[PDB]
């Protein structure tokens, strides 16, 4: 039940963009981007 502290809306994409950049580099087998929303 781990949770992360996040501030305003602008801080959300910066973490997401940083997380997306990190995971995209050292995999090299996949190339794709898929996301959805609920609510």
């Amino acid at each position: 039940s781990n949770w992360f502290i996040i501030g305003s809306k602008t801080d959300a994409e910066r973490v997401v963009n940083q997380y997306q950049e990190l995971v995209q580099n050292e995999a090299k087998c996949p190339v794709k981007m898929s996301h959805s929303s609920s609510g």
Binding site: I5, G7, S8, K9, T10, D11
Partner: protein, 768 residues
């Protein structure tokens, strides 16, 4: 499908734009245009680079007879088609350019087209709101001000972490322009939902003073929203204000008290453990109070300071000096609060009568009472453990409640910067201050660092809320000194402390070791010799009386001679220089300490003279030995009791002692001391920086607090704006550049002159 070539062109074009953009930020536009004219020689330039090229060029022309040239340059390009998202920013820029001149009958449609694109530009709403703001100067149009605050609220929805405090200041200033109808408050409440609560932490005191006043119940929604997220930041001020109202009304149901009680009850259900822990910490602070020995000693020091102020007023008159009724009541209070064997000795010795017609017979006696009480209280204990007289404070850990360091919610920052509580150190110290001996406790966070804090017991809460507002004003202006370059090179910062108000009589302040004042340095040097510290003050008063005893009025020449006599005999010109030479044996440390002393002194002098601050007493300036930073305790505004003229009629602009002038060097008083003031003057005089809004909000409740103390119309607004214009008038008089250098050189030359120092209060210590 060439890709390397276009990437190189894109990178090269971006470098040209960045180099041109940074040249504009340097304050030079002619050289920036030449750099931006280099892109024309490249045959293949991308569309987005062209948009940035013209965006920088139109900004250069906006910052720089020549208005026709800048108007016709934007119509040459932008011929066929642009994309949607960049067809919104430069419509606002040209609309602002049209609003810069008298052409305002056609600029309204320009703003409408700029904002209609996608409704999420901070710039588009800001200039449109600012364009409406210029309209309010005349033809009030009361039912239109709701539109201005509507624009500001929409602009605050997207702007985050920067350039947002000025917008909230405008909202607060325009809220005080309300009539009997409550349509302005209705517009705020319905149009403010959606903004984050992190932006309201910097205007907590401003919201409190509006909630207390009439027709302020509609503001409670914002307070509840802030308290629902951050309970600690809006807990202590609520308790302090609630207790303040209870005490003042007890001397003489209350709607402002009901509002505060209602706010308390809604936050009880949210994190009740934290509120209970905060209550325990406050309730366990009653054991830190001092004994009656220091309370009597502190009161005598305050009475002696008041006697000196009264005695200076009776200058040039007869030697009678009849006792003022204020002093007579103070003596009566001393007898009431003091009248097992030494508690009744003062009644029949010298306090049976406060004095028939003498005043010098009272000051000369209180001198020896201080000496008797100082030597008697030298055996007072300094140590006391936490395991006794209190249990909750000693048995406290991080597993009880989520308690943070007191003072972490003063200024919001993009980073978290949240230090928690780990354990209170069972080790406290008692330090002798200028008036009392306060207790300092050590608090250790979860990171392992130890943060000392000092416990104050200052009375007279009336002259205590005007001491934190000025610190809050300085803290607001601190980030504004980093966006420029001239102020950044000299490493200029105000060095503001952290003060948290818990109770109207007791509050916590940030204290560090090796923080001594200039007057204490004199005490150490004077105690080394065989003379007392109050020799120059006594010699000034009695010798002047003997000169006046011959029936001859005191002139300027006699004041000059006695001032030179004091400088020749008691206090030499190089007392401070010798103290620093022996204290710092290393040459490198001495240079750094002296350089930091000069930098901090310029900011202190600038703040004291420009914004009409309190006079700088020698017991108010504090010097830190660990780093060399300077801070002066408890600034205060200078407002006349008859009316709010906000005038400081003093000979010298600030404190420039001959000891200080020689201490740095005769070169440091001219070059570095004046350059720092000039650099700060330019930063505050830039039209880009919004300074009027911050000053108006601070001076708004300052007059309200003054009016509430000594006995709700347009007069208050006119008085506040008159004070603001005076502030800008003085700021502009020392920031312009012409054939001459500046007016700062004239005022610093008369600050160290002996003519302007001989006509000063001896308590100010012009010689020291």
């Amino acid at each position: 499908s060439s890709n390397n070539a276009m990437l190189g062109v894109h990178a090269s074009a971006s470098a040209i734009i960045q180099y041109g953009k940074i040249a504009r930020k340097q304050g030079l536009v002619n050289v920036a245009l030449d750099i931006l004219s280099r892109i024309h020689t490249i045959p293949t330039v991308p569309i987005v680079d062209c948009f940035q090229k013209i965006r920088q060029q139109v900004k250069c022309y906006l910052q720089l007879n020549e208005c026709m040239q800048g108007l016709e340059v934007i119509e040459s390009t932008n011929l066929k088609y642009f994309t949607k998202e960049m067809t919104a920013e430069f419509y606002a820029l040209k609309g602002m350019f049209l609003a810069q001149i008298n052409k305002s009958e056609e600029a309204n449609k320009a703003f409408s087209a700029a904002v209609q694109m996608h409704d999420v530009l901070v710039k588009a709403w800001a200039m449109w709101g600012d364009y409406l703001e210029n309209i309010f100067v005349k033809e009030r149009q009361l039912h239109l001000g709701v539109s201005a605050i509507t624009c500001y609220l929409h602009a605050c929805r997207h702007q985050n972490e920067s350039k947002s405090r000025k917008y909230l200041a405008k909202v607060l200033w325009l809220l005080s322009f309300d009539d009997d109808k409550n349509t302005l408050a209705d517009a705020v409440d319905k149009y403010c939902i959606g903004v984050p609560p992190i932006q309201w932490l910097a205007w907590i005191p401003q919201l409190l003073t509006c909630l207390v006043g009439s027709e302020g119940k509609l503001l409670l929604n914002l307070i509840s929203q802030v308290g629902r997220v951050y309970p600690q930041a809006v807990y202590f001020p609520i308790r302090t204000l609630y207790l303040t109202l209870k005490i003042e009304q007890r001397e003489r149901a209350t709607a402002p008290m009901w509002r505060c009680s209602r706010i308390m009850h809604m936050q009880r259900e949210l994190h009740p453990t934290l509120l209970s822990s905060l209550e325990g910490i406050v309730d366990q602070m009653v054991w830190f109070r001092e004994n009656w020995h220091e309370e009597v000693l502190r009161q005598l020091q305050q009475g002696l300071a008041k006697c000196y102020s009264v005695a200076f007023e009776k200058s040039g008159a007869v030697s009678d000096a009849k006792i003022t009724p204020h002093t007579l009541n103070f003596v009566k209070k001393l007898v009431s609060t003091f009248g097992k064997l030494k508690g009744q000795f003062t009644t029949d010795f010298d306090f049976s009568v406060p004095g028939s017609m003498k005043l010098h017979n009272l000051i000369s006696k209180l001198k020896k009472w201080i000496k008797i009480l100082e030597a008697k209280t030298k055996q007072l204990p300094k140590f006391f453990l936490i395991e006794e007289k209190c249990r909750f404070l000693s048995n406290f850990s991080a597993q009880t409640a989520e308690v943070e360091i007191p003072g972490e919610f003063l200024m919001p920052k993009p980073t978290h910067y949240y230090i928690k509580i780990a354990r209170f150190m069972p080790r406290v110290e008692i330090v002798q201050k200028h008036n009392t001996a306060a207790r300092r406790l050590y608090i250790r966070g979860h990171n392992g660092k130890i943060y000392p804090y000092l416990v104050m017991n200052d009375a007279c809460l009336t002259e205590s809320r005007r001491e934190e507002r000025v610190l809050q004003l300085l803290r607001l202006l601190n980030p504004c000194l980093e966006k420029r370059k001239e102020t950044t090179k000299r490493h200029l910062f105000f060095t503001v402390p952290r003060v948290v108000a818990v109770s109207p009589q007791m509050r916590l302040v940030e204290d560090n070791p090796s923080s001594l004042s200039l007057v204490e340095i004199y005490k150490q040097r004077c105690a080394k010799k065989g003379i007392e510290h109050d020799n120059p003050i006594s010699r000034y008063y009695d010798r002047l009386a003997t000169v006046q005893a011959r029936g001859t009025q005191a002139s300027h020449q006699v004041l000059r001679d006695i001032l030179k006599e004091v400088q020749s005999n008691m206090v030499p010109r190089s007392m401070l220089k010798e103290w620093a030479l022996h204290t710092f044996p290393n040459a490198t440390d001495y240079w750094t300490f002296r350089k930091m002393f000069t930098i901090q002194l310029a900011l202190i002098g600038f703040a004291e003279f420009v914004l009409h601050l309190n006079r700088l007493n020698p017991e108010m300036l504090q010097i830190a030995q660990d780093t060399g930073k300077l801070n002066v305790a408890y600034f205060r505004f200078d407002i006349n009791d008859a009316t709010g003229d906000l005038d400081a009629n003093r000979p010298v602009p600030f404190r420039l002692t001959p000891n200080i002038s020689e201490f740095l060097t005769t070169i440091g008083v001219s070059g570095p001391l004046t350059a720092s003031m000039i650099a700060v003057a330019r930063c505050f005089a830039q039209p880009n920086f919004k300074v009027d809004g911050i000053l108006k909000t601070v001076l708004r409740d300052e007059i309200i607090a003054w009016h509430k103390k000594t006995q709700d119309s347009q007069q208050l607004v006119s008085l506040v704006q008159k004070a603001v214009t005076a502030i800008m008038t003085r700021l502009h008089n020392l920031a312009q550049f012409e054939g001459g250098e500046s007016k700062v050189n004239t005022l610093v030359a008369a600050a160290n002159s002996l003519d302007n120092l001989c006509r000063m209060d001896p308590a100010w210590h012009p010689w020291l």
